[PDB]
Amino acid sequence: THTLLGQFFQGWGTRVASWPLTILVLSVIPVVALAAGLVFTELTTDPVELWSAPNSQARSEKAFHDQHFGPFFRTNQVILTAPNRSSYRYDSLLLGPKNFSGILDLDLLLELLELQERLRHLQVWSPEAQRNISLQDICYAPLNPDNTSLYDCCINSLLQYFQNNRTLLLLTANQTLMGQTSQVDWKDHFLYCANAPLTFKDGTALALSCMADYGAPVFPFLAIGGYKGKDYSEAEALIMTFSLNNYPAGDPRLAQAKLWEEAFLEEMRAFQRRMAGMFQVTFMAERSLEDEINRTTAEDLPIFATSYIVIFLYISLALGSYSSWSRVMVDSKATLGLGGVAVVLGAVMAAMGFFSYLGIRSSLVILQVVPFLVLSVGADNIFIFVLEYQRLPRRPGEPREVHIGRALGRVAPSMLLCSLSEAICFFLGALTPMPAVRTFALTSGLAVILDFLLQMSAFVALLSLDSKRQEASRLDVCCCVKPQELPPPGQGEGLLLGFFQKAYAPFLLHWITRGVVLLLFLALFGVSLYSMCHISVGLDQELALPKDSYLLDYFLFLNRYFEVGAPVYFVTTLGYNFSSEAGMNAICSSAGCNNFSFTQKIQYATEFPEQSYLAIPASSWVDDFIDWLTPSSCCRLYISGPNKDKFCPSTVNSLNCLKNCMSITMGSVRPSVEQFHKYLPWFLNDRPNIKCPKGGLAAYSTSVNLTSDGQVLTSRFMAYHKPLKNSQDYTEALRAARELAANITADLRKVPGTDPAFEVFPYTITNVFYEQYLTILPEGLFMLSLCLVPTFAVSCLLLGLDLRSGLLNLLSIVMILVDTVGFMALWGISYNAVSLINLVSAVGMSVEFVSHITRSFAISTKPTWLERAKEATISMGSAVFAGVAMTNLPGILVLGLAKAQLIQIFFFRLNLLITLLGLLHGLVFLPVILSYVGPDVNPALALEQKRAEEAVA
């Protein structure tokens, strides 16, 4: 069946080389017709659409949350630290001698106040809206979310303890204690605040409120960072969080938030420049990561285009015959190199265009690296074809058409094998949950297929025209005005086969070198197999960005100085009867509630923050609700009047509403079903004052989704992750949170009247990205096994290879792949979707290294194994080296300047390892192992080629 394709491709090659210009036209027309569809490209840069599987669990959990509570707010942080400012001591009253940091000086706080109050009143022009966007339009106001003001926006900073009042910050009082008097300053209020932030009367001889201006308590971990435990006075970093209201991807209010974020960043860069010796400013907006990813994507297009220029230039001056110094410009193949690269770029653009016709949404991070891998695969085929056509000696009085036909018929089955193997590998690499890598894989897969279809028609027609322009004694690209003259046309043997015949093949196939090489490769396989175990599974941030980013400095500070990670909501899905006494007994953590309840379990989890990645015990709306419902003066009903048995708030101090919230309790307080359903909407819309410090509107306003009639559909309990620094930390944190949530639901599902489909799930904003890494290894190994299958299957069918031949190919592919993963674990390249699609591309590509040598060893007539190995090495080892290896390496070595750590790590280093191991195995190890245990001579395999050449000659 090999020689059948030989006959077909002989016929095809002849028929194409006979009609060059017609075939070039008929081949260019569909490429332009498909590649004109690039104008439909919907370039989506948003991280949730590229890097989350929309059918995964995390996305179903996110969808449920974002439905029942609205989406998660956009955090625009600033982490300030004064490194050169020396620590001092304070002899405070009510507390011991505290050692204060340099950052907790007064002038620095007045400078942070200036910045905070400047960013409050920041305004931007909105051309879509044709007005000035104020912060109040877009800011996340937890208290009073409808008709907000600039002094109602969620701005978490140390100076919230002084409600951003500059008079309260410079304020000093005289306090006498146990006979002795001392001057109390802002330090006393700060410390008393950082201890218990839910106070309205400071205890340090000052009637100073501790709650923020917007009316919620600021916990110390949100305001200060760099301390360790309850030693807040030694805080090294101040934090200033601007929380904006997040809206769905299609809301016209998201442009407003992003415009303000851009203005925030401009103001923060100006502020960073102004304060050089004083502060060390680091900052990010929510738009920062999407903007720093897409900045560097358009800055390394010169460094990408240079790769294809260099591959063109190598292929151009590595098929040119340099014998005499008079006909170099006639021998040099500039037209063929240019044409070959043009054909491959045609194929790539056709693929991108075809996929853009179906409305598939890509990103410039995806349409950047597609041409590289497709070209590194597609250039080798053209190189090997032209090399064979060059080496194949023309029969006497034979025309060029039949010669090109014969050369193509000779090398076409091998190129069909390569192209099919690589296309299948890419289309099996396109099973990834990540839509970005899926789009990449599918585009690359089709690009390789169209590359082959163009190489068979357009490039063969082009080679026919080049051969004609050469034989007519005209120049290459300086031709058609210059048929002048040359010395004798046909010259002797080349330098490539010269080297491979006289230096290499005798050296590699020495008495000693076979034993040494074989031993050394088995040792390398052993080391690689050992080292593959210490692979780091996870794509952390600080890789997506460049190395010159303002976000890297922010991430260094966010890792070093921060005291808690992202907040995790333990969302409770539908089918909990919260009203029942038995219901709310298993959620609360007060006197009378069940032991190992919801909040008790989270509390005890946070007691061990290293095992279960939680730093703070969960907030509880039900615990604070049954706390609110006490016979104290928090909720009271009018004893009589027009508002009889109606809620008089904690603010009014009249005698008319002296009646308590419910009856005179005889122990642990529990409201009845009617009492619960009536009094919960009051609790959730009660602002915490001095009189009643317990109130729902502050924290739990949005953490309960009531029905139209006052049934609780859902509810979320807000804990905080410990500071998560690596991708492994994020993944372990998700795993541990899920395990705890499963343990919680297991106990909550044993309550009378709970639906069995009831579930507690820990939704954090970074769940969708770091969920895949729970099961990337099994998926990856299944994928690489499914990619090793068709390689062998089609390698045994198409090439028509025997059993030993197929198994030697397979053994070599497995060896290359294990070596790649071993060196991945050594160099410090992580395991993820990007590394995985590179390894699947490697499984596909390594066939180009092994298959050519193994075939040309199989189709051999030399007496002894060593002679056949030498022949295979010299002829096809030289073709495979000069083609595959040296059209990979000049392309890869240019991506070493990419500047983006993602490409610089996963597409330079990993492809360099893949290429060099491919080279080493399929030019050092495969000749030796073929010379040892290669397949036996098949005379019919070579002798029937002559019943397939002459018959259709």
Ligand X SMILES: *[C@@H]1O[C@H](CO)[C@@H](O[C@@H]2O[C@H](CO)[C@@H](O)[C@H](O)[C@H]2NC(C)=O)[C@H](O)[C@H]1NC(C)=O
Ligand Y SMILES: CC(C)CCC[C@@H](C)[C@H]1CC[C@H]2[C@@H]3CC=C4C[C@@H](O)CC[C@]4(C)[C@H]3CC[C@]12C
Ligand Z SMILES: *[C@@H]1O[C@H](CO)[C@@H](O)[C@H](O)[C@H]1NC(C)=O
Ligand U SMILES: *[C@@H]1O[C@H](CO)[C@@H](O[C@H]2O[C@H](CO)[C@@H](O)[C@H](O)[C@H]2NC(C)=O)[C@H](O)[C@H]1NC(C)=O
Antiparallel, parallel or unpaired: β 237-244 and 155-157: antiparallel
Member of 162, 314, 440, 452 binding ligand Y (CB under 6 A):
440
Residue 611 within binding range of ligand Z, rule CB under 6 A: no
- If the CB atoms of residues 656 and 702 are measured against ligand X, the closer one turns out to be 702
Stretch that binds ligand Y, among 46-54, 387-395, 611-619, 932-940 (CB under 6 A): 46-54
Number of residues counted as binding ligand Z (CB under 6 A): 8
**Span of 63-71, 88-96, 472-480, 500-508 interacting with ligand X by CB under 6 A:** 63-71
What is the per-residue binding string for ligand Z in 130-149, x denoting contact by CB under 6 A? --x-----------------
Indicate whether 167 belongs to the interface with ligand U (CB under 6 A): yes
* Region from 324-332, 572-580, 766-774, 810-818 binding ligand X, contact rule CB under 6 A: 572-580
Residue with tokens 């340090």: 204
Answer for which of 59, 68, 361, 804 binds ligand X (CB under 6 A) is 68
Q: How far are the Cα atoms of 337, 374, 384, 419 from residue 455, in angstroms, in the given order? A: 13, 13, 12, 11
The string of DSSP codes covering 2-47 is HHHHHHHHHHHHHHHHHSHHHHHHHHHHHHHHHHGGGGG------H
**Considering beta carbons, is residue 67 or 183 the nearer one to ligand Z?**
183
Asked if 579 interacts with ligand X (CB under 6 A), we say yes
Segment interacting with ligand U, rule: CB under 6 A, options 165-173, 585-593, 662-670, 797-805? 165-173
365 lies in the binding site for ligand Y (CB under 6 A): yes
Q: CA of 532: how far to CAs of 419, 483, 817, 818, 921, in Å? A: 29, 60, 10, 7, 18
Q: CA-to-CA distance for 103 and 91, rounded, in angstroms? A: 18
Contact, 620 vs 589, CB < 8 A? yes
Answer yes or no whether residue 67 interacts with ligand X by CB under 6 A: yes
- Say whether residue 173 binds ligand U (CB under 6 A): no
Closer residue to ligand Z in complex, CB, 234/291 = 234
47 binds ligand Y per the rule CB under 6 A: yes
Strand ranges, E, within 764-802:
none
684 near ligand X, rule: CB under 6 A: no
- Name the residue among 806, 809, 801 with its Cα closest to residue 941: 801
Cα–Cα nearest to 741, from 577, 618, 585: 618
Q: Is 472 exposed, middle or buried (0-12, 13-18, 19+ CB in 10 A)?
A: exposed
Containing H/E element for 179? none
Residues from 273 through 312 that contact ligand Y (CB under 6 A): 289, 293, 305, 308
Among 1, 67, 99, 390, binds ligand Z (CB under 6 A): 99
Measured torsion, CA atoms of residues 467, 473, 475, 476, in degrees rounded to the nearest 10: 0
Whose CA is closest to 836, among 521, 554, 283, 438? 438
Q: What's the burial of 360, exposed, middle or buried (CB within 10 Å: 0-12/13-18/19+)?
A: middle
Q: Which stretch binds ligand Y (CB under 6 A): 623-631, 709-717, 916-924, 937-945?
A: 916-924
Q: Which phi and psi angles does 613 have, rounded to 5°?
A: -75, 70
Q: Judged by CB under 6 A, does residue 916 bind ligand Y?
A: yes
For the CB of residue 106, give the shortest distance to ligand U in the complex, in Å: 17
Binding to ligand Y, residues 760-789 (CB under 6 A): 766, 769
> Residue 769 touches which of ligand Y, ligand X, ligand Z, none (CB < 5 to 8 A by kind)?
ligand Y
3-state secondary structure labels for all residues of 892-926: HCCHHHCCEHHHHHHHHHHHHHHHHHHHHHHHHHH
CA pair distance 505, 857, nearest whole angstrom: 14
Instruction: State yes or no: residue 577 binds ligand X (CB under 6 A).
Output: yes
Smaller CB distance to ligand Y: residue 661 or 734? 734
Q: Which is nearer to ligand X, 52 or 579 (CB)?
A: 579
Report in angstroms how near the CB of residue 254 gets to ligand Z at its nearest: 21
Q: Is 423 helix (H, G, I), strand (E, B) or coil?
A: helix
Nearer to ligand U, 206 or 622 (CB): 206
- Residue count, binding to ligand Y (CB under 6 A): 34
The neighbour count for residue 863, using CB atoms within 10 Å, is 9
Residues 635-694 that bind ligand Y (CB under 6 A): none
Nearer to ligand Z, 22 or 99 (CB): 99
In whole angstroms, the minimum distance from the beta carbon of 99 to ligand Z comes to 3
With CB under 6 A as the contact rule, the residue among 1, 60, 123, 668 that binds ligand Z is: 123
Who's near 414: CB < 8 A, 6+ residues apart?
Answer: 384, 799, 851, 852, 855
Partner whose binding site includes residue 743, from ligand Z, ligand U, ligand Y, none (CB under 5 to 8 Å by kind)? ligand Z
Nearer to ligand Z, 89 or 947 (CB): 89
Q: Which of 18, 743, 901, 938 binds ligand Z (CB under 6 A)?
A: 743
Sorted by sequence, the CB contacts under 8 Å of residue 132 that are 6+ apart come out as: 123, 124, 125, 126
How far is it, in rounded angstroms, from Cα 292 to Cα 79? 19
Stretch that binds ligand U, among 7-15, 24-32, 163-171, 767-775 (CB under 6 A): 163-171
Give the count of beta carbons closer than 10 Å to the beta carbon of residue 188: 26
Is the separation of the CB atoms in 239 and 259 below 8 Å?
no
Residue 663 within binding range of ligand Z, rule CB under 6 A: no
207 lies in the site for ligand U, by CB under 6 A: no
Q: How far is the CB of 903 from ligand Y (least distance, A)?
A: 7
Least separation in angstroms between residue 192's CB and ligand U is 18
N-term to C-term CA, the chain: 18
Nearest to ligand U by Cβ — which residue?
A: 165
Say how many C-beta atoms besides its own lie within 10 A of residue 106's C-beta: 12
Nearer to ligand Y, 284 or 629 (CB): 284
Among 163, 536, 541, 630, binds ligand Y (CB under 6 A): 541
- Which member of 86, 174, 653, 708 binds ligand Z (CB under 6 A)? 174
* Residue that the structure tokens 């941030």 belong to: 541
| Binders in 705-744 for ligand X, by CB under 6 A | 705, 713
Least Å distance, CB 746 to ligand X, is 21
Q: Cα separation of 815 and 525, whole Å?
A: 7
Supply φ then ψ for residue 132, to 5 degrees: -90, 115
Residues in region 738-767 near ligand X by CB under 6 A: 753
Which of 922, 772, 746, 773 is CA-nearest to residue 851? 922
Say whether residue 86 binds ligand Z (CB under 6 A).
Answer: no
Among 168, 263, 518, 774, binds ligand U (CB under 6 A): 168
Tell me the CB-side half-sphere exposure of residue 134, using CA atoms within 13 A.
Answer: 10
Does position 165 interact with ligand U (CB under 6 A)? The reply is yes
Beta bridge partners of 225: 237
673 binds, among ligand Y, ligand Z, ligand X, none (CB under 5 to 8 A by kind): ligand X
Give one DSSP letter per residue of 519-553, joined into a string. Answer: HHHHHHHHHHHHHGGG--B---SSSSSBSS-HHHH
User: Toward ligand Y, which CB reaches closer, 109 or 311?
Assistant: 311
Question: Residue for token digits 């038995």?
Answer: 582
Determine, following the binding rule CB under 6 A, whether residue 643 of this chain makes contact with ligand Z. no
Separation of alpha carbons 520 and 531, rounded Å: 16
- Report the residue from 371, 723, 762, 844 that binds ligand Y according to the rule CB under 6 A: 371
Give the range of 164-172, 237-245, 366-374, 442-450 binding ligand U by CB under 6 A.
Answer: 164-172
CB of 221 to ligand X, least distance (A): 28
Q: Which residues bind ligand Z (CB under 6 A)?
A: 89, 99, 123, 132, 174, 183, 743, 746
Q: Which residues bind ligand X (CB under 6 A)?
A: 67-68, 70, 577, 579-581, 673, 705, 713, 753
Q: Which residues bind ligand U (CB under 6 A)?
A: 165, 167-168
